[PDB]
Amino acid sequence: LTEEQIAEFKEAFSLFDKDGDGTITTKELGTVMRSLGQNPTEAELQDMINEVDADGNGTIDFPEFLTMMARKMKDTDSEEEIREAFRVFDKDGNGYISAAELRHVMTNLGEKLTDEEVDEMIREADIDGDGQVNYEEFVQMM
């Protein structure tokens, strides 16, 4: 949405477009991915291309890249904001939000709850039944 921003996304695109022809092919996406220790199959690479390839011509060009890369940024943004929230709630940072941790954090906001009420909250979120709220469950609740 800004000329600086459009240029930033160009540079990102340039790493994928290895031969500089304005398109990213499956192989070029394959070359890049295998530079990052991911070894995806030929059909996995076609799927990733198809997802972004809006006009179905088989490759991704800069406009299509731009569109994808913004959404990825707008999704990775919020996912970090949900992790940091989860971390403020997960007091001992072990990966699971407990009744005591929820009660304790809610209290320091102001919302002083009972053990019954905090159990109900945890139950309302505890999809996997482990008696605690993990990240997956935390994100669905929000």
Which of Ba ion, Ca ion, none interacts with 53 (beta carbon under 5 to 8 A by kind)? Ba ion
The answer to whether the annotation marks 47 as part of a ligand binding site is no
Radius of gyration of the chain (CA): 22
Q: Tell me whether residue 77 is exposed, middle or buried, using C-beta atoms within 10 angstroms of its C-beta: 0 to 12, 13 to 18, 19 or more.
A: exposed
The pair phi, psi for residue 78, each rounded to 5°, is -65, -30
Residue 64 within binding range of Ca ion, rule CB under 5 A: no
**86 neighbors 94 (Cβ within 8 angstroms):** no
Residue among 53, 61, 64, 126 that touches Ca ion (CB under 5 A): 126
Amino acid at the residue 136: E
For the bound state, the minimum distance from the C-beta of residue 107 to Ca ion, rounded and expressed in Å, comes to: 16
The answer to whether the annotation marks 92 as part of a ligand binding site is yes
Cβ within 8 Å of residue 14, ≥6 positions away: 20
Please identify, among the stretches 6-14, 29-37, 94-102, 107-115, the one whose residues bind Ca ion according to the rule CB under 5 A: 94-102
Residue 124 within binding range of Ca ion, rule CB under 5 A: no
Residues annotated within a binding site for Ca(2+) = 17, 19, 21, 23, 28, 53, 55, 57, 59, 64, 90, 92, 94, 96, 101, 126, 128, 130, 132, 137
